[PDB]
Every structure is written in C-alpha cells, then in structure tokens.
Amino acid sequence: MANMHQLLTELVNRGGSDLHLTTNSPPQIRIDGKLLPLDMPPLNAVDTKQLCYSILTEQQKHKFEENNELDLSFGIKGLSRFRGNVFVQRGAVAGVFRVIPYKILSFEELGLPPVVRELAEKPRGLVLVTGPTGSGKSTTLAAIIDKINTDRHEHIVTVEDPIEYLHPHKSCVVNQREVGADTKSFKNALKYILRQDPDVVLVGELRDLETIEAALTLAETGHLCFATLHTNSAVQTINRIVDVFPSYQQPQVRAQLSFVLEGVLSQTLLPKASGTGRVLAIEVMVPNPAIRNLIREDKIHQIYSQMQVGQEKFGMMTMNQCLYGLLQKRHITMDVGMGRSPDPDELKQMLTS
Amino acid sequence: MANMHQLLTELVNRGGSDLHLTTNSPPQIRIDGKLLPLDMPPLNAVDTKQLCYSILTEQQKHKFEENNELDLSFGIKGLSRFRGNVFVQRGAVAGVFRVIPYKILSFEELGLPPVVRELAEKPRGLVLVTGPTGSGKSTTLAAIIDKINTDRHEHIVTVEDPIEYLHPHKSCVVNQREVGADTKSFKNALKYILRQDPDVVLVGELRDLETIEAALTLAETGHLCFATLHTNSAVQTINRIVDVFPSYQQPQVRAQLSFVLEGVLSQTLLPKASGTGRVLAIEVMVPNPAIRNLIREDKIHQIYSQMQVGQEKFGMMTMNQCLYGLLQKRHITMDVGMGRSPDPDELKQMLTSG
Amino acid sequence: MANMHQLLTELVNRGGSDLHLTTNSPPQIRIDGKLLPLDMPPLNAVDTKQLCYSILTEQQKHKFEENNELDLSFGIKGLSRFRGNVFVQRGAVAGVFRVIPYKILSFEELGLPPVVRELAEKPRGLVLVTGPTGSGKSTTLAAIIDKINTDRHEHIVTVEDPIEYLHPHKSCVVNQREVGADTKSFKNALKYILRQDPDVVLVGELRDLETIEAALTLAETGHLCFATLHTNSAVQTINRIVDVFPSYQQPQVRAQLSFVLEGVLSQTLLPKASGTGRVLAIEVMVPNPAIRNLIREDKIHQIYSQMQVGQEKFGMMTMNQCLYGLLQKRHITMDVGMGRSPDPDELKQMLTS
Ligand SMILES: Nc1ncnc2c1ncn2[C@@H]1O[C@H](COP(=O)(O)OP(=O)(O)OP(=O)(O)O)[C@@H](O)[C@H]1O
Ligand SMILES: Nc1ncnc2c1ncn2[C@@H]1O[C@H](COP(=O)(O)OP(=O)(O)OP(=O)(O)O)[C@@H](O)[C@H]1O
Ligand SMILES: Nc1ncnc2c1ncn2[C@@H]1O[C@H](COP(=O)(O)OP(=O)(O)OP(=O)(O)O)[C@@H](O)[C@H]1O
Ligand SMILES: [Mg+2]
Ligand SMILES: [Mg+2]
Ligand SMILES: [Mg+2]
C-alpha cells in the first residue's frame, strides 16, 4: 500500500508528532499525545523493514544491523525534516519518526511568554530548558536560537545527536555538528569548541557530570550556553545539577551556578479544552540577586517562594501560576490542570481566593 | 517413552508451574509448589539432552555448549509458551521449564484487589511488583499490561530476558524487545527507549544502581514504568532502592521516589486449605501525601502505620491484613497464615481482637 | 610396592581422614587428627607422580601441569569417593586425599543434637555451618541435605568445587553442579540459579562480598540456603558477615540477616578420652525474636547471653556448654576441653558450680 513518503506526508498533514511502524499493526500516528491507527492493513516484517530502510543510507543500514539500534535525522524535500529511531522487536524492524518542521514558529505562536524572548538577548550565561520527554524543549530552543540568528552578528555552534532543526545563516554564523558524522561524540566536540571562537553554544542534555562541567565552563568563559534536562521544575533542576557532584565539591558548583545561571524553563504540553491541539504550560525562573544568594547559601528550596512574587519585576512564573492562567482563559479543563499540578492543593488555594 | 511435546502437555494439563528434567529421575512437575514425579522410567543423560535440545535452535545449542548455561523462551502452537533454563549437572544436561499461558487471566481470577486495576489507569509514575521467586510477579504484570493495552491508545515497550507473555496489539501499540536477540542488553535498550516515543515501559528487575536510575528517570519524564524487585514488603522495597546509593546521594533518591512512586505490590503464593491450588497474598501500598512526606523526611518505617489505616480511602493493605482476610474466607489454614506472616504477633492480635 | 588402590583402601579401612603422598616419606594417613606413616619404603618423585596421576583424567593432567595446582574429586567403585589436591614441592608431585563415604551417617551417629534435625525442616532462610578446617562441616551439611532429600518433594541444587558427597534422588530432585566442569564458576552458577526453580541451595563458603550477597538474596527470595564459614562461633560468624561491607551499607546487611538467619552451627572435632575416634563439639544458635532484635539494634555481642539460656526453649547451646556436657559424660579429658574452650575461665566457673 502506502510508501514511506505518503505515510510521512500524512503525519505532517494531520499535525501528528510521531509516526509508529511495527508488525501486526497498521501505521499509527500520535496526534495531541494519543495514538491513532491509519485506515490501512497491518504491516508485516517485510513492510516495516522496507519502509524504515527506505530512509536510510547504506552506511546507516550496516550500522543498524550491527547494533539493532539507530538514531538519525533526514529530510524530505518540500515536506519536512524528521528524527528517526529504528530498533528491533519480536525479530522484526520497528521505527518511530518525529516531525521537525523546516519553518520555525514564533514565540507567540508557541505560547512562550515575553521573558523567553528576553533570554535570547542575554550576552552570556547558562539557560536551561527542561521538561518531560516530548514536551517541546527542542522547539523552544529552536525559536530562541532563530531569534539570536536574526538579531546578532555572533557565532552559534550546536552539537546534536542528531541534528534536528536546521538554521540557515541570517545575521549570525551558525555551525551545526552531528554526533557520529561531523564529530565523534559530544565529548570530542566540546574538547575543541573553545578553539572555534563561539558566542552561543547548544550542548544538548546535561546527561552526566562531564557534560555539566562543560556547560558551566562555557557559561563562565563568556558564552551563552543552552542545555536541556529532563527535570520538571526550576528547584528540581538546580538540585539535580548540584547533587551529581561529590559532597566536598558541591560548594563550588553552587557558586558557579549562582554566577552563570541566567534562566530555567520547565515545560509541559497539555491537551486543549476544545479537544484539538496542545497548549504549553511553562515554569520560568530568572535569577535575581536574592535567588543567586539562595543558591550560594544552599537554600535552594526557598527559590520557589521568590518565583511566586517575581512576576511583574522579572517575568518569573511557577508552574501552578501558569496553570492558573490557562484555566482562567479556559485553555485547559480543571481535570487536566489539577492532574498536572505539581502541588494540586496550592493550585486549589489559588483558585478559591 | 514420552517426548517433549507430551511432557509439556502434561505440565500444562496438570496446572503445574515447572517441569524438571534431570538424570536418574522421572520427569517431575511442580504442582502448587510441590514436586510430583510422573509415572515414567528415570531419564538418562541421552534422554535429558534429547528432550532439552528438541526445543532449541541450532544457535541456542551452540551457545549452551559454549557456556553450559542458557535462558530462553519458546512456544508450542496450540498449547502454551514456556520459559526454559538449560544447565549441566554431574556431566549431563538438565532443564527446567515454566509455563506461560497464551491467555492472560483477569484481576479477579488472579486474586488481585480492585486497587491493582486502578493502577493500570495511572498516566505516569513508578509501579513496583515485588516478592520472592515464583510468586506470580510476571503474571500480575501481564494482567496490568493487558488492561492498559485494552483501554488506552498509547505505546507500550517491554524489555525482557526472555520475552514471556506475548501481548498482541489491542488499542495500544506494543513493542517487546528480547535481550540477546532484539537488543544487546537492558542497558542498550534503555539507552534508546526515550527516543522511541513510549508511554508505558516494562524494564524488568531493578537489578543494579544503573537500572534503578533508568526506572526513576522514566517515571519522572512522563512515563508509566513497571519494574520488579525480590523484596517482601513495601517498606523493605523503598529501603532497598535508597540504600544501594552512596550516602550523600540518598537524599535525591528519596526525593525522586517521593515524587514518582505510584504503587508497590508485594506478593506471595500460598497453598489453598482445600489442598488443590494456590491463593495470592498481597501487600499493597499506594502513596498518599502523608506517605510521600515520610519518604522525603527519611521516615520510611512509619509508612507501615499509614498502610494499616489506608484501606478504605486508598485501597492499601498490609500483608497481615491480607492474610487476615484469607483466613476469614477460609482460603488458607491458620498454620499457613501464621507461617508466612512477617509479624505473627500482629496477626494474632488482629484475630483475637473481635 | 602398593598401588593407589591399595593405599586408598588402607586409608578407608583404618578410618583415616587424609592420605598424604610426598617424596622421601612413606605414605602417611591422618587418624584422629594425627599422622601415621605406613610400613612401606619412602616414595620418590617417580612414585608420587605415578600414584597421583593414576586417579586423574588426561584433561586434569594437562591442567595440573599448567598450574602446578589441582582440586578434584573421584570415586573408586565399591570403596569410597575421595577429594584430592595435587601440588608440587621441591620439584616433585605431592598429593593429599580426603575420604568421602558413599553412605551418609545419621544425626545421632555424627553426634548432632536434635535441633540440627529441626533445621532440616525449615522452609526458608539462611543456615550457616562454621568451624575450622576439617571440623566436619561438609559431613554435617550432607546429613542435613540427605534428610531434606528423604522428607521433602522439593528441588535441591548444590554448587561445589569439587562435588564431594553424592545425593541420589529420594523424594527430592537433587542437582549437583561441579565448578570447572558443570559450571564455569560459583559466580556463573549463582547467576542462573534463580531461573532453575530451586527450593534448597548449597553455595559453599561465603568467601567474598559477592557470595554473601548471593546467599542473602537466596534466603530472602523464599529459599533455604546453606553456606559455610571458617569462623569459630555464632557471634564471630555474624560479625564477619556484616563487617565485610562498607560502613554505610552495614545497616541493611544487619536488617537482612535479622530477617533471613535461621541457624548458625559452629563445630570442632576433639579426640575422645579413650584415645580412639573423635567426638563433635558444636555451638548452636537458633534466632528467637530477642536475638533478631539484637542483630537489628547492632548489639551482636549480647547474643551470647541469649544462647546461654535458650537451651530448653530453642535448643541453643554455647561451645562451653557443649564442652561441659562432653566432660560430664567423660567423652573428653579436662585438658582437651580446657585447651579448646574459647573462654577457659567461663568453663572453669561452669565446672566449680
Ligand atoms: N509550544 C508548543 N506548543 C504546542 N506544541 C508544541 C510546542 N512545542 C513543540 N510542540 C510539539 O510537541 C512535539 C514535540 O516537540 P519537540 O521535539 O520539540 O519536544 P522535545 O521535548 O524536544 O522532544 P524529545 O524529548 O523527544 O527530544 C512536536 O510535535 C511539536 O510540534
Ligand atoms: N495470582 C496467582 N494466583 C495463583 N497462581 C498464580 C498467580 N500468579 C501466578 N501464578 C502461578 O505461579 C507460577 C509463577 O508465575 P510467574 O512466573 O508469573 O511468577 P514470577 O514471580 O514472575 O516467577 P519468576 O521469579 O521465576 O520470574 C505460575 O504457575 C502461575 O500460574
Ligand atoms: N560428627 C563427626 N564426628 C566425628 N568425625 C567426623 C564428624 N564429621 C566429620 N568427621 C570426620 O572429619 C573429617 C573431615 O570431614 P569433613 O570433610 O566433612 O569436614 P570439613 O570441615 O568440611 O573439611 P574441609 O575444611 O577440608 O572442607 C572426616 O574424616 C570425617 O569422617
Ligand atoms: Mg528534543
Ligand atoms: Mg517472572
Ligand atoms: Mg568441607
């Protein structure tokens, strides 16, 4: 029946986030978080292998067959780019494919508050975009980087596994290195990045202690560094970074973070109240002198109280404060807002007042 | 006399849990926990090798002869699936085979309380199914996963060594990866699972620090994660997870567990008082705000007191409370209930209270 | 002169425990702990090599010649089984051989108290048989396992280096794996033993931290686990197990031990007062609720006081209490009892009262 080109076109046309191909099921697309099967016969092992192999190079095929795992990205001219993962289950090939649009949407289209636009103007520091899997983090990062590319005459370097969004040069020089092709690893790229005269660097996830140290060094040496974590809040993000280090070296890490941290964004995507589309809920922490002191004084938990009152001055916003605003504008239902609040009793109190 | 197909048929027909093949003994089938020898001549070394090799591929035969060890699963069309272990003792092949039915029983048939069915509706978090060896853990997990498969339109990924229960697609997309064939290892499968757009993940036993960290990460990144441990209670399960980490990092592990933990099930299978069959005894801990606080404040022991009074509100149940109910229903004898109670004095108090 | 078959027959016939073959000495047999030379010419290097090689397979000969060390067991039909060790000294082969009877003696013949028979009825837990080298530990373990084999319909697995006592099936299924032939190592056997549906497992000596963790896991997962240590008392045994772990993880180990421990037996073999044969002296600790609390409370030393008064209720017995009974029945002399008491002044006090 349908070939890979038609399946990916249907994924794009229907606003799906992921296309799933596996044996004994028809192709399925995730729309607004939920899977929907396409009106097609179920695939067999011949189908899944042929469809997934149709978008691989010969080197990628040999590589997938050596490990039964493969991450990759590819483009279909005139349609979209895609991030693919291919694996093996029950002795057969399976694949998942995520849409990466060629055109980056704006801050207001993505539902990002104006403070996120101001983060794109920071000359230096560490900006963290956090949240659960598939919560819009790469899309937010692409919007920020596109703004920098538009407005600055600086050098942007990204290190990606794989490269997702493409950034053609506007006013910046943008260099994008793909792990496994352009560079051997994140570690090898970071070993030479300081000799490449960067101004803005995207390093991906802060996956281990070595990557955290690289990001802290980048942010301390006069660069604007963007990174991601899978944490769910500003406080949880700061604690996660500090606590990976041995107890005797955590004082320095807290001091470094207090100096270089310029923003923490924690995102989630919620189903809209209408039943179509998803809306962004975001917690924003922008450090002020009080928050930087709390970090140095090892009073990280008290940062949440500072965020509750930093709305007008610094554009800060707790997750519950964002859910409150989404509820008053009727963008989400009460069940969705409550089922997502990190503290439902606090959000209840905010409602009853 | 009998061939492997006939021996596995008797295993299934008799409701046994395991078939044992070893030299100088007839085939034996474990029924309700106790071995029963079949009315057959004892096997010799030729018999044990031939019977076990009849259910192996040539690649599996080569690997078994390379290591004198082998785990595997296989199916017999129209009968059942089986998990097998082949080994060598006294210079001869030996084998044990566990039944894996094609049909997944319901919560009611398995003796699982209604709170277990509500765990299958959880959209995120960490659910732990614990207990001793052969206590029904994989069967409970299959029942929960079959319920999710029936009710949700989500992506379920399992990593198994080997794959036991097979889950055909219902309303979910179900991908099942077998270690050693589909994926190199648990570690390699977990290295890529976040790029496979999952909603529900089965990771197997929390074998080491690395697997615990993977399961905690899965649970906090928006997924429903199922895993097993060989601990015997909810409190012992929480302590086991925290205590594997260095002392300075246990605070973060306790904070993570307090956020993501959605359920701990600890099971044991007991012989029925009727003499035929076994009955499930299960301790259920479902975190409420009080328990999550106790985890963060490093007061894990005080969780047991919360479970004693959380029956009506949250469906919680200590093991002794489950044993009490089984005794009231006359499913088990007093000796069996007392002999398996983790605190016989408490169960005695509960019985002679009124 | 005499061949290996005749030397091993003389070892069996004279009730010896070990036969020694080395150059410039006649064959010597250990009877009741003391060596006695046989009335034969001294052996040379040709003799020792020929005698020891007569009981080796070709693979064992190549193996011994590669390492100058070899542990093994073998049987002589109609006579006995034997555990052998072959080594090299002064450029020549030497060998020691221990008798392993085909018929396992009963509890009363071995001098084991009735509480040891009750340990064979335990459904689950950890049972430790401890004592110095050659103190009867394997023989006690074989008697317990034979009782389980007789009375239960369960699965017994032993891991041995090498297999000593053979256990033909009675009511149990008994599988015995020899390290270096049936299984690669203790570690590899223990890696798969939980997938082999065992009920009772013999794991040998708790030689390292990894083996202790395996035994604690077996005893906690619904199995009856038997293991040995070379400790001399119940308290010394418990302390040895806990103290091998780092200080931060000892709380869990004490908690595990308090849950799974079902018995500690510490044996010694003493020469009989008549001058012929040896008699077993044994310290028995069976945990009661008080002892299990002392383990959790890190009050291990106070367990000895509980054993002094647990004779009638739980069948417990300190080593000195056993020596006291052996002295009143005139089984041992005062010098032997005192020369063996771990606290001679306590045994003195028990005598003068
Ligand atoms: N602000 C947003 N509002 C609504 N939908 C969004 C938003 N941002 C991203 N999405 C959609 O969510 C899906 C995931 O996008 P994206 O890959 O950028 O997030 P992610 O956290 O980086 O995913 P992953 O964890 O796999 O790397 C996409 O389909 C995207 O169109
Ligand atoms: N609720 C139950 N009630 C009665 N019997 C059960 C129940 N659950 C499982 N069993 C039976 O117990 C035996 C073991 O089942 P299962 O393999 O699922 O447990 P397990 O703990 O995962 O075993 P293992 O430790 O080897 O992985 C099977 O024969 C099964 O039919
Ligand atoms: N209860 C007993 N009474 C008298 N003699 C015994 C008793 N048990 C064992 N023996 C004898 O002591 C000798 C050693 O026996 P055994 O090998 O079982 O002890 P062991 O501690 O396991 O030795 P090793 O440390 O070398 O492994 C044998 O000759 C045996 O016959
Ligand atoms: Mg991304
Ligand atoms: Mg299982
Ligand atoms: Mg021994």
Numbering used by the authors:
A (entry chain A), C (entry chain A): 1 to 353
B (entry chain B): 1 to 354
Publication passage describing the model:
Modifying the protocol so exogenous ATP that was not removed prior to crystallization yielded distinct PilTGm crystals that diffracted to 1.9 Å, the highest resolution to date for any hexameric PilT/VirB11-like family member. The structure was solved by molecular replacement with three protomers in the asymmetric unit. In the crystal, two nearly identical C6 symmetric hexamers could be identified. Compared with the interfaces of PilBGm, all six interfaces in these hexamers are closed. Density consistent with Mg2+ and surprisingly for an active ATPase ATP could be modeled in the active sites. The ribose moiety of ATP puckers in two alternate conformations consistent with the small number of direct protein contacts to the O2’ of ATP. In addition, two ethylene glycol molecules from the cryoprotectant solution could be modeled in each packing-unit interface. As these crystals formed only when the pH was less than or equal to 6.5, we hypothesised that PilTGm may not have ATPase activity at acidic pH. When we assayed PilTGm ATPase activity over a broad range of pH values, we could not measure ATPase activity below pH 6.5. The corresponding histidine in PilB coordinates the nucleotide ɣ-phosphate, but in the CCCCCC PilT structure, H230 is facing away from the ɣ-phosphate in each of the nucleotide-binding sites.
